[PDB]
Amino acid sequence: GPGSMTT
Amino acid sequence: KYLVEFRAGKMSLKGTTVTPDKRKGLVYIQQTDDSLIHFCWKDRTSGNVEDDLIIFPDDCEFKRVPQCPSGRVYVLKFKAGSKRLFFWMQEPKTDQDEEHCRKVNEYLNNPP
């Protein structure tokens, strides 16, 4: 995905 | 009665793994009619209040977790049980991150 804290 | 508010997500624990929750969130401190101070987290889409913790002076510290490069992560640490709740700043600018942190500590531990 785009990262744990990225939308 | 809303003393501090800022956009921030929360995190979840599954087993022993901490995973950031991607929900748009709001951290806020509210003093209720009984004069108690509540540290809260609500979902900004639904309005769902999921965290609501009554906190007295010296119970808690709120601090940056500086070693994380993938977000602006803060920890609400409780003396009692060494319990920790993680949050991650969601404002698109970082200008007010440390200020929000300061105000959390001020209103929990040394209010005006």
Numbering used by the authors:
A (entry chain B): 0 to 6
B (entry chain A): 21 to 132
Paper text:
The CP is capped by a 19S regulatory particle (RP) that houses three ubiquitin-binding substrate receptors, Rpn1, Rpn10 and Rpn132. A pleckstrin-like receptor for ubiquitin (Pru) domain in hRpn13 binds ubiquitin and proteasome subunit hRpn2. hRpn13 Pru binds proteasomes at the extreme C-terminus of hRpn2, which is otherwise intrinsically disordered. Here, we report that hRpn13 Pru also acts as a generalized peptide-binding domain.
Crystals were obtained for hRpn13 in the absence of ligands that diffracted to 1.85 Å resolution with one hRpn13 molecule per asymmetric unit. We tested and found that the electron density fit well to the extreme N-terminal (ENT) amino acids, which we define as including the residual G-P-G-S sequence (aG-bP-cG-dS) of the purification tag and M1 – T3 of the native hRpn13 sequence. ENT forms a U-shaped structure with the non-native sequence along one side and the native sequence along the other (yellow and orange, respectively). ENT forms hydrophobic contacts with hRpn13 Pru M1 at the valley of the U structure surrounded by P40, S90 and W108. These amino acids are similarly involved in proteasome binding by interacting with hRpn2 P945 and E946. At the U hinge, a bound water bridges native and non-native amino acids by forming hydrogen bonds with the dS and M1 backbone amide groups and sidechain oxygen of T2. Analysis of ENT in the context of the neighboring asymmetric unit supports this hypothesis, as ENT M1 interacts with the W108-containing surface ( ) of one hRpn13 molecule, named Pru-A, and the F76-containing surface of the neighboring molecule, named Pru-B. The sidechain oxygen and nitrogen atoms of Pru-B D78 and K99 form hydrogen bonds with the main chain cG amide nitrogen and aG carbonyl oxygen, respectively (insert). Between ENT and Pru are 16 residues that span S4 – N20, which are not present in the electron density map.
